[PDB]
């Protein structure tokens, strides 16, 4: 029978809005989460949405023939320079299924194959920076994750090098598309956007869109003009086929895609990873001795980076404690109940809170909050949908490999090459942006003298 859907605190007409006046919302709808249960309404003026939070609720979610991806508003504002991309596109454009499977092989597990090398090459250049540290000097965490990340996915997404480990201000680009993506991200709180106040804020995001776009469609246009073939996606996309290849305005808004979907989702999954490396030492020496053990040669090779095992379990343990793009909607296909509770109008909007997911006691355990790699020891013991730090279903994640095939790499070579130090007894503290990160995350790096 049907269900009152619960909903927190309303404020006359601002709705649930001001429950949100805090710049971490996600961690503010995971403590309604926590009062609320596994589902709740919220509103702001002229938007609602159902935020959902068990695995009972978001496996039925995840039916693909039931519900499909919507476009929230943040990646509503994002398309103003990721475009049509497949981020930012819904299923039912033309150009989402075109991208779609013109791409996916070659963002295959076999494919990492191919982008190995450059990411050895971005990965070397992250721990080279770290060997040449001063004694006393310590690491800012998520900002050398970034840098790596950044131009990992700039060498493998269209062989261009941002030389961030170059540099104390990010290449142009960079500094386009991070100031491009806050202000994507501004614009959600803000309620008068047409104060002339953002006429500057306005006015630099047409400064950023135009610099993104004149670098990618520079490069995209020397390809074309060289046909040089190259390791990166830039050369799978200039090569795809349906009949017809991807027009090179989409494959633009790709190469801008990887680097917005992938920059920061992964480098908050480093630095959480080692956030929690550092805070649990047996945990780390576990994971140091496997690296140790099987990252025998001065570059790790491809079919080594699979054998880190227990890596690849403190990632995905970092992954659900702290899913670093936290949150995805979609939206009911057709008039439907969920759960035998609660009717949905087609159209409407459903949130699926991945930390909460994550936490989800009746499938985890009453130890959620704990860091415990072991949970992933055998991944088939995970429920179907118990798990979701990359997505739903045919608009899921399309760099999971990528991403955890760099982590890995990476986390790999830290852990061989350094003892860390928490010098700070850091405190964590999670900033929000788009995604989520360990705001001022530092530690020591002490090497153990391993030649590259
Ligand atoms: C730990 C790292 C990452 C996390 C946690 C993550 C998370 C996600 C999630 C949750 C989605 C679905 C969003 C939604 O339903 O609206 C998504 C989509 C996507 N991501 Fe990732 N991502 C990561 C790394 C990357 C990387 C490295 C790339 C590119 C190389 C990338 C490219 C994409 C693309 C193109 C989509 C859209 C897929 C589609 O709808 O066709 N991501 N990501």
Redesign the pocket.
Known sequence: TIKEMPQPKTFGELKNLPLLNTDKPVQALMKIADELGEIFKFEAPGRVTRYLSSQRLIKEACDESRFD?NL?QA?KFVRDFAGD???T?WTHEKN?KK??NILLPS?SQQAMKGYHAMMVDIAVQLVQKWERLNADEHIEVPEDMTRL?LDT?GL??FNYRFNSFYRDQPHPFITSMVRALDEAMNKLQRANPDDPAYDENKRQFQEDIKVMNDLVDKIIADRKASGEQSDD?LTHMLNGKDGEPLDDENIRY?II??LI???E??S??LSFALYFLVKNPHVLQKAAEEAARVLVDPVPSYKQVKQLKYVGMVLNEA?RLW???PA??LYAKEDTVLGGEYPLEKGDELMVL?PQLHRDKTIWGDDVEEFRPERFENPSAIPQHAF?????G???????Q???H??TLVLGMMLKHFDFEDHTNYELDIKETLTLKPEGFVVKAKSKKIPL
């Open positions: 991806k929230s990646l991309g497949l981020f596109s989402w991208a779609h963002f990340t996915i493998c997404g996606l790709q895609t990887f979907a992938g920059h989702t992964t908050g999954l992954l899913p670093t793009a995805f909607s991945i979701k730090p990359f997505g739903n045919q608009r899921a994640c399309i760099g999971q990528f991403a955890l760099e982590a």
